[PDB]
Structures are given as structure tokens and as C-alpha cells.
Design a protein around this ligand. Structure first.
Ligand SMILES: [Fe+3]
Ligand SMILES: [Fe+3]
Ligand SMILES: [Fe+3]
Ligand SMILES: [Fe+3]
Ligand code: NI
Ligand code: NI
Ligand code: NI
Ligand code: NI
Ligand code: NI
Ligand code: NI
Ligand code: NI
Ligand code: NI
Lengths: 169, 169, 169, 169
């Protein structure tokens, strides 16, 4: 084993590698959305900026897990990153609804990782998940939920979508 | 009696204690409204901020009456603070209408306190009420009335409610 | 359910609402103490300031739980706030002893909330409690314990109470 | 009559002249106390400063009434200023007790002046009394009451009197 490895279960190591792939996938989905909203026939620059920054954040989430893997003496194994589920994302509201669903899927995976870490009595890893991931995920889900409600109020189509887009820009 | 007490009628002392409870109740109502407007299915941050600041102000009104009670040599008696009349406040307009009704109820109580003070020939207390409470109350009622009119013009639902909320934020 | 709700048990939601009421009650108790110590026949401005700031802090604790309820998709339910157990709090030492007892009651409630969250496998909530509440509570209990010991040394009556009051101011 | 005189009753004019004398008398009493506390066998510099500043304030109160008399077209009539009731004021506590009694006598005179003004339907004068005199008087009575309580706690003799004197300096 690695000279640093201590109290680090192989199941947690493997689950971290799977989570790295999921974070990279989420980054790719948000990158797709970002440039969809810069199409000349879409032109929603607030949504584009929101999803560009979300894509950057998920790439950083993946990197933080890669750093963690190395810190504990596990070994990073990278797999193919799936194509985003769509090439075109529809309205601003439909993209936010897809984002909410994705964030909740990621949250479920993080909670399953926490259960794996708890069951293997790894408090360093439950700590990482609670402080660096679970809090960010709940905050993101509440923010996107708020955004869906505000957009449904303002629009969700036409002038209201145009005006809501400005609050993101 | 207190070593400081002079020209301070027991009826005014008791009426101040009842008003302290009413100010604390109004603070509680506005606190309820503030966090109602931060629900993920409401998401009106301008309304939330307006009612948060209103809640803070009413708590300060209560404290100023508590300080006054002590200044005159009366004794503060604190009672239960009733639960707000609602748990959910409806639309922004319905909350403002409830706020206007509450502010007018508080105003009526303050005017009755002024009549009690006048009838007991307490010009220090009629002074406090005129300068620190009655002016603020009339200004608040005019402001909320204005807000109701502006929101009815802009909305009061949908995009207009969304846009009006921004002027409060 | 709320569009944001995930892994949030109804028992935790209800326990958070009960804790909100307890924090508001503690705020009310400390508000009572604060203005008791500004009576002309008490006149302990250091104690008054200590309990005024404590009252503000407990109101903030309540608000942080209200924000948390909304963040997780629970629904805030506000109840009557009981009158403080006393109208007059006696000596500075007796008030600190009452405060220590109240802080330990609040701590016990927070620990029971943590046990509820743990038993329902909610690591986001055990996280909130550990980082935002349990640490503050233990620090507050140690501070008030220290204060009781210092006041018993200095006074606890007469000149020593007068001098101790200055270290709080 | 004066070219400026309007709605100014001769009874109010005479009562203002009597109040001018009372304010000057109070200034003289506090001047006596101030230098009593600078005797080599008393040596309480905090008390001395407190009463020096109180003496200055009462002289300013007299001058504000003289300015008011002129403003309304009344005519200032100045009378003998009585010697202070004592030449030696005893302990710090006895001086504060004498000051509290004097401030309450002045307050009673001001309230009688307000009743005279009210009965003669002079709202300019009831205004002056409420804003410039009655508020200051109640604040002064509460402050001296607080001071008596703090000094009784700290001392009122010996080391506690020595230490209390420092908080005034
Ligand atoms: Fe992520
Ligand atoms: Fe108010
Ligand atoms: Fe608390
Ligand atoms: Fe005066
Ligand atoms: Ni579609
Ligand atoms: Ni996020
Ligand atoms: Ni309705
Ligand atoms: Ni107001
Ligand atoms: Ni006792
Ligand atoms: Ni605390
Ligand atoms: Ni004597
Ligand atoms: Ni004064």
C-alpha cells in the first residue's frame, strides 16, 4: 500500500473514483448548457454565465476529490465522460429543471458515499463530505429551486424570461 | 415607589406594558412574513428584506418602551407573545394588506395610549408618543399604502410582482 | 413535497420547529434580564449589555434555524413564545445561575436534535448542529461558568458585584 | 406690548421669570457641591466634575428661558439668588440624595409651568417645555437615581466611594 494510507477502505477509494466521474459529467452537462444559451437563436447571456460558472465549479469539485484520493493514498482511476443527455436544452426553465434533477442525483450519490464512509468508520471522509460537498449541494439545490420559482413568476416565457435572464447577468 | 417616579400614573404604566407586548407581537408577525418570503416556492427576496427590517424595527420599538418604563420608574411586566395569526401569508399583496391592517391596529393602540397619557396630564409621555411612535406609525402606513398601490399597478401577480420585488431589494 | 426536499425526515422538520421556539424563548428571557439590569434600583450596565447581546444572539440562532428549515424544504411553524419564568431576576449572580441553567437546557435540546438527526441518517443536519450550534453552546456554558466563578470571587455582592459589572461593560 | 408678542399670557411670562430664578438657584447649589468636593479633606474629583458640569448645565437652562422670554416678547425680571441650603454636603451619597430632591423639585415646577401654559392654550410654550426641559429633567432624575444605586452597591463609604468616584472622573 501507499506509505500514507491509514484507515482508508478500498470501497471508499472506489466510490471516490466513481464520484470523480460524476462530477466531471456534471461539469460537461453545464458546459453544454452554457454554450447552448449563447446560440444566436437562444441568446440568454445570464443563463449562459450561470451555467458556465456551474461548469467551472463542478470541475473544481472533481479536482478536490482527486486531491483527496491522493491525500489518503488511494489511486485515481479516470473513466470515459459520457456525452450530455441532450444537445439542446429547450427553454431557460427546462434547463433549470434539468439542472435541479442533476443536482439531486449528485446529492443522492454524495449521501450514498457518506453512508459508505460511515459504515467503514472513516470520520476523515465523512468530514470531507459534510464540509466540502453536502453543504454546497444543499445550497445549490435551494438556489436552483428559488430560480425556478422566480422564473415561473416572471415568465417563464417571453418578457419574463428576458427580464429574469438579466438578474443572472 | 421608585426613587425616580414622578407624575407617572399606574394606568399609563400598565398601558405601556400592554404596548410592549403588542410591539413584540408585530415584530413576530413580520419575522414570520420575512422567512415565508424565503421559502423555495415563494422566493421574493425584496419582500423578505422589507419584512426582516420591519421585524427588527418593531423589536426596537418594544425596547424603547422598556427603556421608557424604567426611565419613569415603572416596572416592566412581560407576557406571552402570541403566535402570528397565519403561518402562510399568500401573495406579496396579501402580506402588504395584512401589514397595513396590523400597522393601523398598532396606531389605534398608540392613539389610545396618548389619550390615556393626556387624561392623566403626563406631557412627558404624550411627548414620547408623538415624537417616537406616532410619527413613525403614520410614515409607515403611508409607505405601505404607497407600496400596495405600486404593486397593484405593476402586478399584483406574475411579472409585475417579480419586478416590484426588485425595488424592495 | 417541496422541489428541494431530499433526505429530510418529518421528525427532524418538527424538531427544528420546536427548537426555533426554544431559541426565541431564550432570546425573550435574556431581553427580560437586560432591562431588569437597567432598572433605577438595579443599575448594572455591564450585566445589561451582556444580556442584551445574548438576547440578540439567540434571536439570530432562531433565524438560522428558520433559514435552515427553508433550505431543506421544510415548513416553518411558529408557536406562542412563553413569558419569561420571572419578571425580576435578583442579583447578578442569580441571573447568571438562571442563564447557566437555561443554556444547559438548550444544550440538552440541541443534543436530542442531533440524536434525532443521527438516527434518521441526516449528515447535513448533524453537520449544522455540530458547527453552528453545539460549539457555540459549549463555549457559552464555559463562559457563563467562568463568570459565575469570577463574580463569586469578586463579590458576589456589594463592591465586588460593582467591580465585576465593569468587566462586562 | 412688544411688537412680537402674540398669544403670550402674562401668567406664563411671570412663571418663566420664577423658573429662571429656580434654574439659577440650582446652578448655585451645584457650584457649591462642586467645590465642596475639592476640599482637601473631601477630595472626590469625580463628584466635583459631575457637579461642576451640572452647575454649568443649569446656568444654560436659565439662559435658554431668558432667550425664550425675549423671543415671545416678555420681559426678563431677575431676583436675588438664594444662598444654597447647605455650606457642607456630607458624603457623596448625601450630595446625590440632595441633588435628586432638587431635581424633583425643579421637575415639579416645570410640570406646573406646563399646566399653566396648557390652561392658557400656549402650544409654543408647552412645546418648549416638553422638548427642552421635561425630557432633560426625567433623564437627569434617572441618571442620579442610577448613581445612588451604584454608589450604595459599591460603598457607599470607604473604598466603594473611592472607586465609584473614579467612574465619574
Ligand atoms: Fe459537484
Ligand atoms: Fe411599532
Ligand atoms: Fe441559542
Ligand atoms: Fe434645569
Ligand atoms: Ni420544450
Ligand atoms: Ni453547486
Ligand atoms: Ni390568496
Ligand atoms: Ni414602521
Ligand atoms: Ni434572592
Ligand atoms: Ni451563547
Ligand atoms: Ni451625615
Ligand atoms: Ni440635568
Amino acid at each position: 500500500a501507499s506509505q500514507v494510507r491509514q484507515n482508508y477502505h478500498e470501497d471508499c477509494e472506489a466510490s471516490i473514483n466513481k464520484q470523480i466521474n460524476m462530477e466531471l459529467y456534471a461539469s460537461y452537462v453545464y458546459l453544454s448548457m452554457a454554450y447552448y444559451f449563447e446560440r444566436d437563436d437562444v441568446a440568454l447571456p445570464g443563463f449562459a454565465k450561470f451555467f458556465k460558472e456551474s461548469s467551472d465549479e463542478e470541475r473544481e469539485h472533481a479536482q478536490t476529490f482527486m486531491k483527496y484520493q491522493n491525500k489518503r493514498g488511494g489511486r485515481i482511476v479516470l473513466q470515459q465522460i459520457a456525452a450530455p443527455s441532450m444537445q439542446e436544452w429547450g427553454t431557460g426553465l427546462e434547463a433549470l429543471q434539468a439542472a435541479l434533477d442533476l443536482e439531486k442525483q449528485v446529492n443522492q450519490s454524495l449521501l450514498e458515499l457518506h453512508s459508505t464512509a460511515s459504515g467503514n468508520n472513516d470520520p476523515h471522509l465523512t468530514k470531507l463530505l459534510e464540509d466540502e460537498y453536502l453543504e454546497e449541494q444543499v445550497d445549490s439545490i435551494k438556489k436552483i429551486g428559488d430560480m425556478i420559482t422566480k422564473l415561473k413568476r416572471a415568465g417563464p416565457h417571453g418578457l419574463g424570461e428576458y427580464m429574469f435572464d438579466k438578474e443572472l447577468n
